[PDB]
Amino acid sequence: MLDAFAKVVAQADARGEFLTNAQFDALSNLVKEGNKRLDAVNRITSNASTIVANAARALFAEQPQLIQPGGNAYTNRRMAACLRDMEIILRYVTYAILAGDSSVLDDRCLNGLRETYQALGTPGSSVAVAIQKMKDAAIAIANDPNGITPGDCSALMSEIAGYFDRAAAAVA
Amino acid sequence: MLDAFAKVVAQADARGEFLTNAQFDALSNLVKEGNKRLDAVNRITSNASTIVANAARALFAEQPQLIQPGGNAYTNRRMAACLRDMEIILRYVTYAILAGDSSVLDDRCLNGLRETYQALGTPGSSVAVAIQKMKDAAIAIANDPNGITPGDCSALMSEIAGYFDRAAAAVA
Amino acid sequence: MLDAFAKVVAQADARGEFLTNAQFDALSNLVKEGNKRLDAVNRITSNASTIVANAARALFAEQPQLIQPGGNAYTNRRMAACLRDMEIILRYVTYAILAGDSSVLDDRCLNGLRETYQALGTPGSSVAVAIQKMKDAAIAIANDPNGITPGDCSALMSEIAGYFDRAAAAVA
Amino acid sequence: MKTPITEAIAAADTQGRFLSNTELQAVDGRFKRAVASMEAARALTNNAQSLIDGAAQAVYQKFPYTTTMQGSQYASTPEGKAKCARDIGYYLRMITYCLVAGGTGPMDEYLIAGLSEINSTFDLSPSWYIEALKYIKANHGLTGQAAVEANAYIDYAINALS
Amino acid sequence: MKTPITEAIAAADTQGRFLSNTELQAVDGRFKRAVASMEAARALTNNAQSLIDGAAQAVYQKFPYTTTMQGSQYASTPEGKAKCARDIGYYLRMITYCLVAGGTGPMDEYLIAGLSEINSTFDLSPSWYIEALKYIKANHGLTGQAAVEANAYIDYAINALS
Amino acid sequence: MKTPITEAIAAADTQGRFLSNTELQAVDGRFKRAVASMEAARALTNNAQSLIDGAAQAVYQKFPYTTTMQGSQYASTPEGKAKCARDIGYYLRMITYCLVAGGTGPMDEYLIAGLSEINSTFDLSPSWYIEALKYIKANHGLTGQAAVEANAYIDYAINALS
């Protein structure tokens, strides 16, 4: 996989070049913004169980056909698998946040996922809704101004939203 | 896999329903007819070697191109493989008889078999003939009125014929 | 796999025939020409390292885009893989020479190789050039009149050239 | 799905052999026991609503805090009470399926697998369901071997929750 | 198919290395022995019909019950007698292929593999074929190393049936 | 590619768990050390040409036979001298990438893997490159932790060649 730094290095190597004054400045800024990134990962991770459970409850309340006998989330084994998927997706999204790049999310999670759901008969459009719910909850938690040094994390939240939407699009 | 009983249960669960008075009666009848089913399985199984050998001999007498040098059943290794297939098919058909459902036969035997023979170059039309021969011999043995309490097993024989024809169609 | 002798046997068996007076004579000639075949294999094998290195150097001198940053042979890991492939191809070609049949080369090396290079993004046309270079060097070494009992090895060299061209065509 | 018949076939198939008398006797045992099993299944089905209604109240009585505590995982709201009754009905339905199939397969597949994960995630106490199962066992009204059959699967569910 | 050459290549290939002098000497051994092997192969082929006819009668003489007993697996009927002669011809043909290839490969692939399964399924006695092979060995008329070559593969077949 | 961040993620992913404080502290360590690493990276890049030119001459001086011996694998011809300078530039570039990534990943992937195979095949002596790396280490002009950073990756390359 790659993180934001390795990504720039890989691009420079393909061209056989040393980094430019600008590239150095860009990477240095990422470092200066590191604290905020660490807070977002810690905050989301620390509330992972509630983010998944709350999103799952909301999904089934909105879409009761999923839990109705015959539905794809009916039976404990399917419900467990569904809950697991939510947790897995959230897990990989947080990895992307820490890395500052979506490579790990794309390679280890999203790639081939749509084809997996199609083969199983799982409604990807419904998974997308679940992802969107976790997205809104994850950002509200990460960007909560309480109990943290005051500052602007808007760019980071936009980046985080991007990963969630990316995952949602990969299944929807 | 599923047997006749599990099949009804699976259908009821998909609908989230308890069994109806009729369904209970149907399954109870199957039980009452259990003895006949056990006799058919025992009788066919107890003559498995002759059923396969006799059918194989007949097939090669009818279709000598199969054993002619170059034929698909030429060489001991191919003849052995051919004999093995006959025995395998008969084995799975008997499992279906015991279960009262073709699921095990379809899942563990017939699925992908046509594609296997095509890749190998084995003539499925000839395998179908072999299956039909075992079918006629298996039913004659299972429905032999000698040495058994007199009764009507016509429905069961029709069911048994169905499994054989099912296997024959899956390769032909 | 098969060698020149097993090949004739396989053809005769498919027809269920003993060998004919001619077939016996053909195989006997191959045997009488065995010494030359052993010399070609020993000579090529004994210079395998230089044949590959010299061909590789020539290829990169002719096609510098291959080693330019971004090129498919750029980085030590890709250059090593490239060198390895050359050596592998030469190895299998020599096996074909010893056997007097291209079966081992086709089955264990060339089959699926074009598809491998396409998936990786390796330019097969360039590999073909590398193969052709090893071909010319291998034949010059095998057919060197110095240090060997004088005789005509033209037929054998034509056979050897055939295997190399076969490998070149399988990737080009 | 685990039944005496699929289990007989699975054994022979793993050994790559035809069914033998060893397996056929097992199926006969299953056919003979079916009489008692079906009697139990029909009774529980016929009396399903009263058993479910009674079982739910038995839980509320043992655990009163389940009818008043705030939270979606309790029965303190119409919705919670509906979810609870639904769940108990699922258990009873599974028990009848096991009796019909002559094995634990149905409950194993549709209910026990993932059971721990579900109760932990949704904050459902296993103790609630054990109480409901104990009520069904005490009040199904069966006797003789039909009772033995019903209780074997009810206790199987209780052990899966313990 | 197993020959001294494919065996040499297989060894080098499993080790991922080029052929060495170790393997080349093996092939030379094979090329030198070919002289005797081919002499044996040509003789057995030239005299194939008489050897097959004689071998079949040798079996019938050792096992008279093979010419009179009822059943398709005996030679008591034109068809059975044709199947028998065919089989013996298959063995002789395989022996010549082994001599031509310089190895057991042909017989291993076209005949020995599955041999036990075939004889058991069709009720063919291995003893019948051993007698036929003994006849061919005793009467092929070869001497010197050509005999050593022929007998090595004939005895190889006999051991595969034992 | 190996960095403190991808390494943190790999650990959590192999264990199938979310990142914990254990991993987050590692990344913070990386973010804090970046200051020194970037200082080193910028300096080596800014001074790349003089370091490369000087390093090449240091090799020619230590190994004079590299400027006169006949053969394409020596620097005795314009082409050889260009290949040499190119190679040294590759090493310096890799060192800056490692500093930027905060790990050995870049050098591990683009240079060390296959390194032994390359030097053996093209008859390049590892001793030549070690001398060039020693020159860069002695003359990069860095002090304090920026020096510690630069030297760690230079010595890493030297050990990979030893």
Ligand SMILES: *[C@@H](C)[C@H]1/C(=C/c2[nH]c(/C=C3N=C(/C=C4\NC(=O)C(CC)=C4C)C(C)=C\3CCC(=O)O)c(CCC(=O)O)c2C)NC(=O)[C@@H]1C
């Ligand atoms: C947006 C996400 C919210 C926000 C963030 C914010 N955080 C900081 C500063 C710090 N964050 C940490 C946290 C860590 N450091 C670590 O090494 C680890 C891993 C164990 C963690 C979790 C630290 C140490 C700091 C600096 C000291 C401090 O507490 O201030 C800032 C300030 C940026 C600047 O730190 O550098 C900001 C803006 N602030 C918000 O209002 C959002 C809700």
Ligand SMILES: *[C@@H](C)[C@H]1/C(=C/c2[nH]c(/C=C3N=C(/C=C4\NC(=O)C(CC)=C4C)C(C)=C\3CCC(=O)O)c(CCC(=O)O)c2C)NC(=O)[C@@H]1C
């Ligand atoms: C059709 C297939 C033929 C036929 C069958 C037939 N069988 C029975 C009755 C019995 N069969 C058994 C056999 C078993 N019981 C077992 O537990 C096992 C496994 C070890 C076997 C093999 C038994 C015990 C009976 C009952 C006692 C008896 O011998 O009668 C019937 C009678 C149905 C009724 O048994 O219930 C019938 C009709 N009859 C035929 O004419 C067909 C050729």
Ligand SMILES: *[C@@H](C)[C@H]1/C(=C/c2[nH]c(/C=C3N=C(/C=C4\NC(=O)C(CC)=C4C)C(C)=C\3CCC(=O)O)c(CCC(=O)O)c2C)NC(=O)[C@@H]1C
């Ligand atoms: C063409 C390829 C060149 C050529 C070949 C040539 N070689 C021979 C004869 C011999 N070659 C060997 C070599 C071996 N024998 C072995 O068992 C092994 C494996 C360890 C090897 C490598 C031998 C023993 C001979 C025979 C004795 C001798 O040295 O002459 C011939 C003569 C053919 C005839 O041998 O039989 C020829 C023509 N000659 C050339 O000019 C080509 C450059």
Ligand SMILES: *[C@H](C)[C@H]1/C(=C/c2[nH]c(/C=C3N=C(/C=C4\NC(=O)C(CC)=C4C)C(C)=C\3CCC(=O)O)c(CCC(=O)O)c2C)NC(=O)[C@@H]1C
């Ligand atoms: C939940 C919101 C929805 C839902 C989910 C559901 N998923 C499955 C089964 C699988 N999901 C995956 C996905 C992954 N596996 C991985 O290892 C990774 C990366 C770490 C991913 C993304 C896989 C492989 C499966 C199948 C294998 C398995 O189930 O173990 C199911 C099960 C379906 C079934 O058993 O038939 C379900 C129900 N279902 C919904 O209705 C929601 C919309």
Ligand SMILES: *[C@H](C)[C@H]1/C(=C/c2[nH]c(/C=C3N=C(/C=C4\NC(=O)C(CC)=C4C)C(C)=C\3CCC(=O)O)c(CCC(=O)O)c2C)NC(=O)[C@@H]1C
């Ligand atoms: C016999 C009547 C005909 C015939 C058969 C024949 N079959 C094969 C080879 C294979 N058959 C299978 C099928 C199965 N394998 C399974 O495990 C199961 C379920 C338990 C089935 C149904 C497979 C997998 C093979 C290939 C693998 C193998 O041979 O081991 C052959 C061999 C062909 C060959 O070696 O080239 C033959 C000859 N051939 C006939 O002419 C009859 C009409």
Ligand SMILES: *[C@H](C)[C@H]1/C(=C/c2[nH]c(/C=C3N=C(/C=C4\NC(=O)C(CC)=C4C)C(C)=C\3CCC(=O)O)c(CCC(=O)O)c2C)NC(=O)[C@@H]1C
């Ligand atoms: C060299 C002249 C050219 C070149 C080659 C190149 N090849 C690869 C990678 C692979 N090559 C193979 C081929 C084989 N593997 C085998 O086991 C056999 C039979 C014994 C063959 C023929 C395979 C499987 C690979 C991929 C697996 C691997 O690399 O280990 C590469 C690597 C590409 C990459 O890492 O992305 C390269 C560079 N490249 C050129 O530019 C030359 C024209």
Ligand SMILES: *[C@H](C)[C@H]1/C(=C/c2[nH]c(/C=C3N=C(/C=C4\NC(=O)C(CC)=C4C)C(C)=C\3CCC(=O)O)c(CCC(=O)O)c2C)NC(=O)[C@@H]1C
């Ligand atoms: C009743 C004894 C007590 C009670 C129950 C209660 N349960 C839920 C929610 C769920 N129950 C299940 C159970 C199953 N689903 C299955 O597919 C199967 C097998 C067929 C079983 C046994 C599941 C999956 C859920 C969650 C998903 C859903 O809503 O269906 C709730 C709601 C919890 C919530 O937060 O929304 C309640 C209240 N609660 C009590 O207090 C009773 C004592």
Ligand SMILES: *[C@H](C)[C@H]1/C(=C/c2[nH]c(/C=C3N=C(/C=C4\NC(=O)C(CC)=C4C)C(C)=C\3CCC(=O)O)c(CCC(=O)O)c2C)NC(=O)[C@@H]1C
């Ligand atoms: C002769 C020594 C005695 C004899 C022979 C006999 N054999 C058969 C039938 C078969 N023989 C084979 C043998 C082979 N098939 C092969 O592909 C190969 C390798 C190339 C061999 C060795 C096979 C497969 C059969 C059965 C299928 C077929 O008919 O070809 C029979 C007929 C048996 C029958 O019941 O139809 C006979 C009579 N029998 C004797 O009594 C002789 C002493």
Ligand SMILES: *[C@H](C)[C@H]1/C(=C/c2[nH]c(/C=C3N=C(/C=C4\NC(=O)C(CC)=C4C)C(C)=C\3CCC(=O)O)c(CCC(=O)O)c2C)NC(=O)[C@@H]1C
């Ligand atoms: C310089 C210290 C001495 C010197 C160098 C020299 N090198 C080569 C050829 C090659 N060098 C490499 C090295 C790399 N390729 C890579 O992709 C990477 C990682 C990014 C490295 C480090 C390679 C692969 C080659 C061969 C292929 C090529 O030409 O690029 C030569 C030429 C050798 C030849 O025979 O053509 C030379 C001369 N030689 C000296 O004497 C200096 C002391």
